[PDB]
Design an enzyme around this catalytic site. Structure first.
Site, short mmCIF file in Angstrom:
data_model
loop_
_atom_site.label_atom_id
_atom_site.label_comp_id
_atom_site.label_asym_id
_atom_site.label_seq_id
_atom_site.Cartn_x
_atom_site.Cartn_y
_atom_site.Cartn_z
N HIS A 145 0.81 -1.21 0.00
CA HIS A 145 0.00 0.00 0.00
C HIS A 145 0.85 1.27 0.00
N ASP A 200 -0.09 -7.45 1.03
CA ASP A 200 0.43 -6.12 1.42
C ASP A 200 1.94 -6.10 1.64
OD1 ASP A 200 -0.97 -3.34 2.11
OD2 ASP A 200 0.74 -3.52 3.48
N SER A 232 5.67 3.08 8.59
CA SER A 232 5.27 1.87 7.90
C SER A 232 6.31 1.50 6.85
CB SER A 232 3.89 2.09 7.27
OG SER A 232 3.51 1.01 6.44
#
Lengths: 465, 465, 412
Positions: C45, C76, C121
């Site tokens: 993502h 992901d 992230s």
């Protein structure tokens, strides 16, 4: 009554994206109000049909929607003139008829449709004041009626009637007031008459003329004495003249405008209007037609001069609108060059753009005059990220002022200089004393793959091809 | 005045439980409005007395409650017709008299009682538009008046008067609007007259006819040319015909309906209604009586045909209501089989059932046509948990499509196949490619003890015994 | 910790509602880290629709342009590289910062799943995103890439099943009391196993693992998991032994496992959306990104029921079957009276069934008939004069700034 001449306007819009000028936004439909008048004609707001691709009209007692034709768009006065081929739409409605310019505190009744509703809505008020105002922000100021009844989407464009059942103008939702302030405007009949008579004569809208000057009051007596004004004379001092209003260069800074078409102008810029009523002198100007001439009497060097000046429309460096045309753009090496207008600033910075846009741009919006008929504020809008433009990705809304030592006058000029550039390097002089340098050969070659990446049909708007 | 003909309706209801179809809910009382008309008759809403077990009427100036008789219930038009034996109730009230179908923007006054209140309430508005609408969602659409006055429980069923003191219809609370939108409906006098004249002729309500077709506009000229329409002709294309409207099978898909009973139908499905007013052509149909015939003129294969079609009521696969009858159910081995109607879906999924019910069911609600006069959507509603049905307890609202290889047409058919099943196993084919298998002998034996556990009087509704 | 890098991402993502356009560039900052073999790990993502990913080492003044190697949408995870050798000379970063950070609960536990519920992230355990991406998923993702040299996803058995918990159901199909498994309801026509398996087979075991009546296999002491976990552990193209009961007999099939083909695809692996246009009729194919872009995050409730039925319950009957809709009608004189058609399925063109977008586009090009007749859902039809409808297209594209009548994949 006569409610049956008050129609709903369904309009399908295809708006340009001013931030992404190669795109048109998704089709959408809006509804507003409008009314039938004499001669197989309908009146509505210009804003209600801007960027129209189809217009339909619905009468209140019938489900049927009739395909309409847009005859002319008067953006400055916010009026659109429509017709309909289907005779069934016209049959059996008595057309709205126009009354005289109302007096203050006269009763006014505004007839239209609610937002998203197809039933008749009726709103009452009084004329609270005469006003000169812009119907499009940053655009030419015209006569208007202020009424103590609020207007909202939906009813804007419906007719406003006096107690004798005559229409005294087209309702208009205030741009500068929250809906709860219960204040709205009516585009008055002399403005309406200006627009229809203008169309009926030229087979097109030709705008509202301006003189092309800024002025300063003359209320201080020492100021008046020091420039030779006799004690009976009054008027306003010319601060500055638009370079691109050439018929007005016969005027000069610090002329004192004494009268316009015979009407005596006071030290505060007002002229008599009616019994006990004074209004700004620009109403004398905007009631004329583009191309009309006007007698201007000035004091120049303590002596009276009189000039007959052909009047034209105002050309703004940062235009208030671009007449529904597509915004111009040009791309090289992922650099997006476009020009600055009000819709561009609104689309880039939102409703509060007059406070959130860069001060460099705000200066030019609020204060700059075009120095030539074709001058444009050219900016790098954004950089479409790619290897060729590494190190430049943060550049946003920054004026381009020169290309390889030569001044940039407008977008077409810059597009020409980039096409005919034979130098090894392309050197853009930007605002804030920045430069952008690109290798000419590799940058032109990089463009196509960027277009593809971003689904850009062409490197330029058609007006530059 | 005449306030004294406007009565309060006290109704005791005993509603079926559509989720638990062996139960009747607790008795409860509701109050609404109604009015006395000519001939010892009272008018109220059908919804105000649905599932009635006793109705009483109270005049505004007297404590006394009079036992009333329900003469007929018109659910589709939301009208109930009552009488009263006690002559004291009638004595001294002048009956409401009916006026003509109002014009748009005519004044209307609605007289009724507040919620839980026994004093007269008076509400004013204008007729804002003519409309074709359902008075019961999913049921046949009829003429109605839309008014700018909100209606709430309480006053629905009271009379609506024009300024001449004549009643122009029965107030009706909007199903599709929040109470604050201040919009309500009036069931108009021609609908009322249809219902009384229908009762006076047949000694019963016989409904409102439909043609039994779906249609598509013909506004595109290439569509019209490609099917032979001369330039003066207009109408609508038949998309689909109800299999169970056999008088209409004389019509065929892609017929172009040109007119109905002589009235010319336009490309958008509108017909002229009054001066400057157009309405959908279904008003021509629903103003007739069930059993009436209608002249339908179509274009078929570029040629004009004319048909005389006997008109009937609409039979919906998933019915909008079941006429106050008890819902049908059948139980074996704790499997509860029932049929899907709108009240079932509402009781299972709440007010938003059109979004929260299973998509398999919503499809059939929104789009399926009954393929036969007795077809029903049969579902497993729930499984009453017991040893015999271990492993099946999670099955909820799932269509049964076949039993031991044979298609299920309706609940009675399935009840017959289960009773006469001689095979070792009962194999139900359910939706989502599921099967339910039960040993025939042990499952029939398990049923009784489950009934007892859940206090179920019988394994089936009486209509299956 | 000097192998934790900063990841600046510029995204250009397609407009699924207007498939000829790309939304405005926007930027994301993320973390990542270097592993062996000239390879960089990050989230999916965080680089979806990347137009440029540059990387910046700890304490370095230089940002190196990266190349993304593989994006694992179903799980992901993404994987990048950098050609410059100086980048490979010898925990993440706060937003707007170039300095390393080291941080809620860790522990605190509680296509198909990995099932572990509860700046910056991308960083390095496994790959954080904002839980931590586990390493049993990473390894499958990596080993998948390290084998196919691309990402192939996770295989599925293309079957729907029903529990076999009820005794009489079991006896009626011949299951002895010790036998357990699940009953095949339906099999995907575009799965290879749609050959060899049959409806109402009882699946008893998979690679020798016994499948319970409720579809679960053993997992850990005191815990079970659905048998689909077994299948998602395999790799695309692997074989697996599926043992079933058919007509009271035991059969065991060796089935080569494959990727799922969904009729309404859950995503389109970053490929551009396709469209075809004639006379202002915009045809496109229904995907979940389309439904989401058309109807919002509640699309499973707001989309039309005809489409929701396809989304929830339809299987593709052909390998190239797509659900083709009229997306919208770009209003013009040519299409007067058709302007309200929105997201409605095309089922036929001039009598012939429409199987997918390229098929429809081909039939329109080769149409020599006088009229173009589209059969739509809800028993509607669209008729256009063939000559004038083709002639009207170009000005409609011009008005809407559409570069051609179709996406490049339909030039093909």
């Amino acid at each position: 009554p006569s409610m049956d001449a008050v129609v709903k306007v369904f309009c399908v819009h295809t708006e340009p994206n001013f931030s992404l000028p190669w795109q048109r936004k998704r089709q959408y439909s809006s509804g507003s109000s409008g009314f039938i008048i004499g001669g197989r004609r309908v009146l509505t707001n210009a804003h209600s049909v801007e960027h129209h691709t189809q217009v339909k009209l619905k009468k209140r007692g019938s489900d049927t929607k009739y395909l309409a034709t847009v005859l002319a768009i008067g953006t400055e006065c916010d009026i659109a003139l429509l017709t309909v081929t289907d005779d069934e739409f016209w049959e059996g409605v008595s057309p709205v008829e126009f009354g005289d310019l109302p007096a203050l505190q006269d009763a006014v009744t505004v007839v239209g449709y609610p937002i998203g509703g197809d039933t008749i809505s009726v709103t009452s008020g009084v004329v609270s004041r005469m006003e000169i105002l812009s119907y499009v922000h940053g655009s030419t100021e015209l006569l208007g009626l202020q009424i103590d009844a609020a207007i909202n989407s939906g009813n804007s464009g419906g007719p406003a009637f006096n107690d004798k059942g005559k229409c005294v103008g087209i309702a208009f939702q205030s741009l500068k007031h929250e809906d709860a302030e219960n204040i709205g405007y009516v585009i008055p009949t002399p403005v309406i008459v200006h627009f229809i008579q203008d169309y009926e004569k030229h087979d097109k809208y030709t705008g509202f003329p301006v003189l092309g000057i800024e002025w300063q009051k003359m209320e201080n007596p020492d100021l008046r004495k020091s420039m030779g004004m006799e004690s009976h004379q009054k008027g306003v001092r010319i601060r500055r003249i638009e370079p691109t209003a050439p018929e007005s260069q016969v005027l000069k800074p610090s002329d004192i405008i004494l009268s316009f078409d015979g009407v005596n102008i006071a030290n505060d810029g007002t002229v008599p209007f009616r019994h006990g009523e004074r209004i700004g002198f620009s109403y004398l100007i905007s009631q004329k037609y583009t191309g009309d001439s006007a007698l201007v009497k000035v004091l120049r060097n303590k002596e009276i001069l009189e000039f007959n000046i052909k009047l034209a429309i105002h050309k703004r460096l940062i235009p208030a609108h671009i007449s529904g045309k597509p915004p111009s753009y040009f791309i090289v090496a992922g650099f997006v060059f476009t020009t600055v207008s009000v819709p561009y600033l609104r689309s880039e910075y939102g409703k509060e753009y007059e406070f959130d846009a860069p001060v460099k741009l705000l200066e030019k919006h609020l204060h700059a005059m075009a120095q030539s008929v074709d001058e444009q504020l050219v900016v790098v809008s954004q950089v479409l990220v790619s290897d060729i433009n590494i190190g430049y990705e943060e550049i946003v809304n920054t004026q381009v002022v020169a290309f390889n030592g030569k001044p940039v006058k407008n977008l077409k000029g810059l597009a020409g200089m980039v096409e005919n550039c034979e130098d090894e390097y392309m050197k853009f002089n930007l605002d804030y004393d920045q430069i952008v340098v690109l290798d000419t050969k590799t940058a032109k070659e990089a463009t196509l793959d960027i277009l593809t990446t971003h689904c850009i049909p062409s490197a330029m708007s058609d007006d530059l091809k």
